Subunit: 289 residues, 4 copies
Amino acid sequence: MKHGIYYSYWEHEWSAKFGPYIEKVAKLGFDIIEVAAHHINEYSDAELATIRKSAKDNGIILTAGIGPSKTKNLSSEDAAVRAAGKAFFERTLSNVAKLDIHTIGGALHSYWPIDYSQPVDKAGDYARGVEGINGIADFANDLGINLCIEVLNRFENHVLNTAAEGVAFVKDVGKNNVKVMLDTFHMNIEEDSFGDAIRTAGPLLGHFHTGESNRRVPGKGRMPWHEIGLALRDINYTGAVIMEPFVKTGGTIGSDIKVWRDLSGGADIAKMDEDARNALAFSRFVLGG
Amino acid sequence: MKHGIYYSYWEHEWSAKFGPYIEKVAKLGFDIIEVAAHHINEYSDAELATIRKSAKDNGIILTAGIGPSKTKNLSSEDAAVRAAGKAFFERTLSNVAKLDIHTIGGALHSYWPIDYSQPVDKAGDYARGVEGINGIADFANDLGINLCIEVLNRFENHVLNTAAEGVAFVKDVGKNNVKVMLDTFHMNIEEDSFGDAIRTAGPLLGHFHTGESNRRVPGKGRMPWHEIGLALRDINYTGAVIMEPFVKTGGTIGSDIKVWRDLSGGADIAKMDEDARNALAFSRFVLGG
Amino acid sequence: MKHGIYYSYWEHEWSAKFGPYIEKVAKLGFDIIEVAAHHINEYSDAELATIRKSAKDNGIILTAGIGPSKTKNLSSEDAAVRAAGKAFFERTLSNVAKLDIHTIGGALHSYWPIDYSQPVDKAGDYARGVEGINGIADFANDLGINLCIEVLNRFENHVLNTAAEGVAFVKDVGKNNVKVMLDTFHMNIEEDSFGDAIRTAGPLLGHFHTGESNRRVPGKGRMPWHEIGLALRDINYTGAVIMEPFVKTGGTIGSDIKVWRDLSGGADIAKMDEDARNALAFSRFVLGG
Amino acid sequence: MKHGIYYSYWEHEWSAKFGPYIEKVAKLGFDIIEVAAHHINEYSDAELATIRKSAKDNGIILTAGIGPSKTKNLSSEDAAVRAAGKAFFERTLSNVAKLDIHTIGGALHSYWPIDYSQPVDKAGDYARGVEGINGIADFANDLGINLCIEVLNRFENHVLNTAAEGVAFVKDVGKNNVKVMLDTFHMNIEEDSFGDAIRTAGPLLGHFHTGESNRRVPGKGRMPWHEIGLALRDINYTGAVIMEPFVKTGGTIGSDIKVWRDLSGGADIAKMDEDARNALAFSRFVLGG
Ligand SMILES: O=C(CO)[C@@H](O)[C@H](O)[C@H](O)CO
Ligand SMILES: O=C(CO)[C@@H](O)[C@H](O)[C@H](O)CO
Ligand SMILES: O=C(CO)[C@@H](O)[C@H](O)[C@H](O)CO
Ligand SMILES: O=C(CO)[C@@H](O)[C@H](O)[C@H](O)CO
Ligand SMILES: [Mn+2]
Ligand SMILES: [Mn+2]
Ligand SMILES: [Mn+2]
Ligand SMILES: [Mn+2]
């Protein structure tokens, strides 16, 4: 079981480049650094070479998250959008492989952030989503990549909200490299039980995100970490545990994650790194590995 | 300390009339039935008189909720909207008084649902909301009505997300009949601690909403009820404790509250009542009253 | 899944007869009333049939708890004592069957109270305990009785302190009608996790005791009832859930259970019954049944 | 706020010399090492000075725990025992002062381990304990030592089992250098709420002991660490937080603490050290320091 952090924790814009963070994160002690995959597409093969090398040199693994856009996704009833989504995913999957990344996670079956101004079609999105993910599974698999379908709360997704729904969705896809993904922030809202949600995912759990109920780093809040660690161990989980804290207001990140107030205690960068380091030590000790 | 339930618990649409629930809810054992304040505005004086007498004859109190619309919100940058908002409230409070209602709660400082498609101005909406609520406090006061400002999670309000922020707002208002209102559903997401949140509201807590993290009736989930009851008693809360369960998909209520899966276990009305009745017994036993 | 209560909740002495309690408890709404075997050996075959009749008439099931004495225990190093123990057990079991009782629980593998003034022989006591219980299993099974071995905290027993140890012991016994028994008060001290302890017992869980960490009626405290309820349902527990609260000081019970302060809140019999009725409602709602 | 550990963690006898641990514990990162006042009165003035200098050179603070014997306690009915007890405390206090220890804690009001072999007199022992502590308070105060009265579970003490009882005791003593002492292991059994208990102790909280419900190092279990940390902060606790784990079977320690099974995971010293070190980082991060 390896631990990582989403570099966006230190930024305010989703577009900020992660290159510099590879070494920073490694020095903080993390086994993994999770990055935003759409960025991977704007880099030349040489720049990607730098990155892959920077990671191996600093002894750290990269993992990526993907938030499909409304115009390029797999669940849309609009066939052109679905085609754009398929074309976009295959390209990204290819570039992700250049960085030796083997896990892609996020709302891959849909798009994020979701737009509720217009009515929503859950059954239809569910059905198209399954076809869509099934359609790119082999491609990802050939690049040795797992596609992890993240379960989100009602405000961020209307198709998969509980581990049970995520598991059903993964079984319909019927691919060995497609897995369920849970996030404590989301479970805290939707799940009847943390331990049960994790046990429900079981062998299908392929990626894991952590944070307190208001997205502070692990260890700051009332989350049932002890129960969480026990259940992760019950299902012999050896995948990644990525903390995804969002404690700074402002920018596209602040409005997209809806961080309306500062939750870092007005922390400077040194304090940010400290909380991360402490959260890491906390997660290793309470969760495992 | 008195217990009540939001009648829309039994409905799929906001447009369902509450009149018939007066006796139903009273016979289930509740002390209060909470009702939507917009519905009151659609009744004739005679129907209102009928309703007022029905509540009286059934030994049950009426409490009300208000969700200002984008067209009537006291915090809008557009002075015209603010004026409409003021007119809307005065009108509503008058009608609310015809039913002998002394408690109005909800996001009175803003609008709901909210639209995050346009940038948000927190400091601006905050300042405007304070003046706007201050501006209608006396009017409401002359009617014997307390205005309880509800603290909501980040996905439903961008100004007041915490008990601390709620207290600060009520203070800047500086009115005796303007209070803070907390809701376990919202607290569960935003607060560092349930107990500290309730203690932080203290003498200012004027209204209270309950439900599990996914909105089922109190007692079905992992909410820290023991801790919540101890804190409510610790601040000597003698206000209302209103369970606000939303376990049914479909309808306007389903889409607005984002109930994308059935959380009632396929409950018929009889099951619905039993759950409400058991949650009621639970709440009296664990929370007080 | 059925609910009961240990009648001594109302007494101060172990030597209090439970006959009158059959109707009182049935009328309070419990499906079961747990009684003390100590007494059962005293009543005549005639008085016994009267009790059996009273329970059938009030439609209530009886369950029994046994606290073997140090002069009559199956784990004794002394062979004379082990023989008295087996004789004491067959005799008791014969009488228990006259009351139509099918479940006996307690520290059947040892003796209670217990005496730590002398050195302890853990391995020896565990070993004889297995042989001893194995020695009487069939006799009990012929009578349709399950022997539930209760796991207790370190202050009350030195052999079986966890569900894992309880299960290990039940397996070394190798009898179908010998089961493991858990008690929330004891789990609260020794277990790493309530849910895991219950899952560890799984199919072997034959009887269950409930109470808050300090022995008040369930629902009065911080016990993880929601968690306990999920685990019980996960393992399809359909056995009995007996609350065993001890909130009164004085008498032998006060001394043996170490109730050094009142925890009833100066409750008179009527209050004691209200608390019992509420804890029952609570247990049925949160735990199931 | 400072952190420490009871050296007995690595031992099996209350009579193991602690001098060598001064350096080890300091190297592990602790601010404090808690010592047993067992030996102390047998060390020569020279030895004590060596120990004191060792603490200085290693920059660590010393604290002491005491367990009065049945023959030298202050609550005894026999006037001779109370006299020997007072003589014992003055002697111990003087030598503790030579090691520059300013905090003494334990069941100072009575004796440990308690013996329930014979009947118990709670009111009497209470009254005598109050006078006995009041009686040695000034002697301790001249040395600049605070006497912290430990609240223990029912199995270990019959007089003070609650934070409220301990606070009532300390008030009757009416001495500025006699405070209340809480221990999470003991609180886990007797208290209604961890936070309320800590809040109740308030400004009288002088010392604090930590461990999981079954006595493992802090962070290994389900203790409500977050709630506990918020409470200590609520009361501005700047005292010491001493983890007191007992995870090894065997010896006098093993039988007095009733450790009937290994809870260290068969840990060799290096692992014992890693666990302590990890519980330390954990405690500093969750509780503060
Ligand atoms: O949990 C979250 C935000 O709610 C992220 O994991 C997000 O889903 C990803 O960055 C894009 O899908
Ligand atoms: O908690 C909620 C729903 O999120 C309600 O109390 C709502 O805010 C009110 O009905 C309008 O303001
Ligand atoms: O839990 C308890 C008391 O600690 C009882 O169930 C007891 O064990 C039984 O009455 C005799 O074995
Ligand atoms: O809590 C404990 C063990 O139960 C210790 O602090 C003990 O009380 C002390 O060593 C003597 O009083
Ligand atoms: Mn996530
Ligand atoms: Mn609400
Ligand atoms: Mn029991
Ligand atoms: Mn202690």
